[PDB]
Design a binder for this molecule. Structure first.
Ligand SMILES: O=C(O)c1ccc(C(=O)OCCCCOC(=O)c2ccc(C(=O)O)cc2)cc1
Ligand SMILES: [Ca+2]
Length: 258
């Protein structure tokens, strides 16, 4: 019934490991593109199907390798994922939004034949770590066609974003770089009350929790992307009536459960 539905019915344990699809990679060289610093595309292979696309930005000082595990994880559950490198490692959050915009335009219009064949360019979303998560919030305000935004331990001087793009924010309890009380939580609270939004806080987690295999980040990022990029309501079960002992905070307006 849902033409975008991919993969077997999910279970929580299946969302903590790589998923049903084999993954190929394509390296986007810095010299080959303008507007961002290249990156790595993770995309499903061994299939004739098409999938939604995700542009993902790393944080301050970081490069695409800091989110390689998550690019591969998401792609293996049925997505085309472009993890960008930035023009400069010291670009700020709004600059990272601009480079996510360029990466999405690249995916739509100039990506390789092998990627385009697996991509439904009508269904795009964004995610990002730290300053990259700040960029995710900015681009969500500018591009209302985006299906979802997932800021991970986000950082931004702007605390106020107006978007109707559904947002799930992951905060890290022990984050000293982007403290949840000054970044993640104000981001969540100042989003419109009419926008479907979720905030989860990982117990004991550090600012660098997004940079390596993390079960909770896997579960919530996959499920939010599935729900909104694919209209796949089978993933509501992991986002609704949540009782997760990995979390030390959870806030929502519960607009995503029906
Ligand atoms: O993402 C992370 O993992 C992360 C985030 C923050 C820090 C941090 O210690 O922040 C204070 C020092 C840097 C401030 O950087 C800017 O304010 C800025 C503003 C605009 C631009 C621009 O491109 O115009 C560039 C840079 C460390 C790591
Ligand atoms: Ca603002």
């Amino acid at each position: 019934s849902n033409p975008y539905q991919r993969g077997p019915n999910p279970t929580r344990s299946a969302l903590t490991a790589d998923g049903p699809f084999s993954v190929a990679t394509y390296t986007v060289s810095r010299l080959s593109v303008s507007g961002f610093g290249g990156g790595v595309i993770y995309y499903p292979t061994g299939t004739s199907l098409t999938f939604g696309g995700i542009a993902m930005s790393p944080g301050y000082t970081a490069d695409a390798s800091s989110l390689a595990w998550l690019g591969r994880r998401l792609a293996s559950h049925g997505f085309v994922v472009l993890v960008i490198n930035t023009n400069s490692r010291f670009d700020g959050p709004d600059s990272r939004a601009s480079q996510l915009s360029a990466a999405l335009n690249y995916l739509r219009t100039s990506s390789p034949s092998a990627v385009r064949a697996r991509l439904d360019a009508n269904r795009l979303a964004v995610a990002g770590h730290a300053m990259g998560g700040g960029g995710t919030l900015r681009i969500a305000e500018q591009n209302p066609s985006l299906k979802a935004a997932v800021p991970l331990t986000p950082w931004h001087t702007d605390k106020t974003f107006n978007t109707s793009v559904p947002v799930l924010i992951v905060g890290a309890e022990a984050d000293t770089v982007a403290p949840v009380s000054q970044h993640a939580i104000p981001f969540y609270q100042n989003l419109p009350s009419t926008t479907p939004k979720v905030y989860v806080e990982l117990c004991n987690a550090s600012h660098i929790a997004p940079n390596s295999n993390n079960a909770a980040i896997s579960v919530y990022t996959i499920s939010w992307m599935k729900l909104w990029v694919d209209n796949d309501t089978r993933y509501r079960q992991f986002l609704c009536n949540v009782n997760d002992p990995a979390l030390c905070d959870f806030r929502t307006n519960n607009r995503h459960c029906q």
